[PDB]
Amino acid sequence: EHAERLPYDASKWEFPRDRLKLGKPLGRQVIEADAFGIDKTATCRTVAVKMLKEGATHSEHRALMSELKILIHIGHHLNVVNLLGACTKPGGPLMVITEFCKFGNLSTYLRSKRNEFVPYKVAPEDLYKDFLTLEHLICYSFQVAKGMEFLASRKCIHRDLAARNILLSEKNVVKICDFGLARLPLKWMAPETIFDRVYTIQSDVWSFGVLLWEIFSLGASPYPGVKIDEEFCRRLKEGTRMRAPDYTTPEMYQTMLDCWHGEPSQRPTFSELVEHLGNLLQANAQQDRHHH
Ligand SMILES: COc1cc(Nc2ncnc(-c3cccnc3Nc3ccccc3)n2)cc(OC)c1OC
């Protein structure tokens, strides 16, 4: 522990405070902001900033610094919300700067497309402008799997993998968020975790399965109308699983069931999920041949 005390390479991460223009809050305290020359992708770009509340306790200060160090340790990957810089030197508050995902969380976004989805578009395709398709959904799944494969390879156990924690950027790029931290979460927890309290990469795979259900239900709430009590936990341990979501393919539902294997060691690995989802994305394209 005590990650906040790890060596910090200022030459690589320190960012000038006045090269940052704070904007409106995104949550709490995360703030949207404009950065000037933080990377070689453009002169100006929007970013997300986690700022240490003023009058914060020493403990809270250590927590935020620890988060920064953990982000640095983990490293970069296209499918995770990446660290861009930090303001740690005297003269102002501690700030951690990350990439900004313009479209918010995936669950909310998918729910907004309930009446704007078709498995495959048909010509004239303009009748389905901006609609989601099976390709989009499988692609989102594929991306998160790749992001988790990377996190798992860095020995990072997410613990709260859910659609609400997947953010959408431009060009349908999705990123996993809240992975370097210090309602009804039980609906995403593996049986061993509910009863034994220990999180592992394998319990993250179980959560990934629920996330897939969320994606192919277009943002629906897991276990529709079910009371999440002891009876639920008991039935889950016994083998009860959700039925297929409305927009799933047969292969995707089986993959959901595979991720929900009662035995942790029998669930697929994220690397296996990456290979499989990639294969399904490729096979789905083979179904859309009007323009071949
Ligand atoms: C549509 O507008 C929204 C945009 C975002 N984007 C975003 N982009 C980057 N990082 C975070 C982010 C959000 C919450 C917590 N952390 C982060 N990123 C972060 C991680 C580590 C260190 C600092 C920031 N969020 C999130 C929203 O809500 C989820 C949201 O709806 C209001």
From Swiss-Prot:
Changing K50M: Loss of enzyme activity. Residues 20-279 form the Protein kinase domain. Detected in cornea (at protein level). Widely expressed. The active site is at D160 (proton acceptor). N-glycosylated. Ubiquitinated. Tyrosine phosphorylation of the receptor promotes its poly-ubiquitination, leading to its degradation via the proteasome or lysosomal proteases. It comes from the Eukaryota. Changing P264S: In HCI; somatic mutation. The modification Phosphotyrosine is found at Y128. Disulfide bonds join C156-C177. ATP binds at K50. It is found in: Cell junction; Endoplasmic reticulum; Cell membrane. The second and third Ig-like C2-type (immunoglobulin-like) domains are sufficient for VEGFC binding. It is linked to Hemangioma, capillary infantile: A condition characterized by dull red, firm, dome-shaped hemangiomas, sharply demarcated from surrounding skin, usually presenting at birth or occurring within the first two or three months of life. They result from highly proliferative, localized growth of capillary endothelium and generally undergo regression and involution without scarring. Belongs to the protein kinase superfamily. Tyr protein kinase family. CSF-1/PDGF receptor subfamily. Homodimer in the presence of bound dimeric VEGFA, VEGFC or VEGFD ligands; monomeric in the absence of bound ligands. Can also form heterodimers with FLT1/VEGFR1 and KDR/VEGFR2. Interacts (tyrosine phosphorylated) with LFYN, NCK1, PLCG1. Interacts (tyrosine-phosphorylated active form preferentially) with DAB2IP (via C2 domain and active form preferentially); the interaction occurs at the late phase of VEGFA response and inhibits KDR/VEGFR2 activity. Interacts with SHBSH2D2A/TSAD, GRB2, MYOF, CBL and PDCD6. Tyrosine-protein kinase that acts as a cell-surface receptor for VEGFA, VEGFC and VEGFD. Plays an essential role in the regulation of angiogenesis, vascular development, vascular permeability, and embryonic hematopoiesis. Promotes proliferation, survival, migration and differentiation of endothelial cells. Promotes reorganization of the actin cytoskeleton. Isoforms lacking a transmembrane domain, such as isoform 2 and isoform 3, may function as decoy receptors for VEGFA, VEGFC and/or VEGFD. This is Vascular endothelial growth factor receptor 2. The gene is KDR. The chain holds residues 815 to 1171 of 1356 of the full protein.
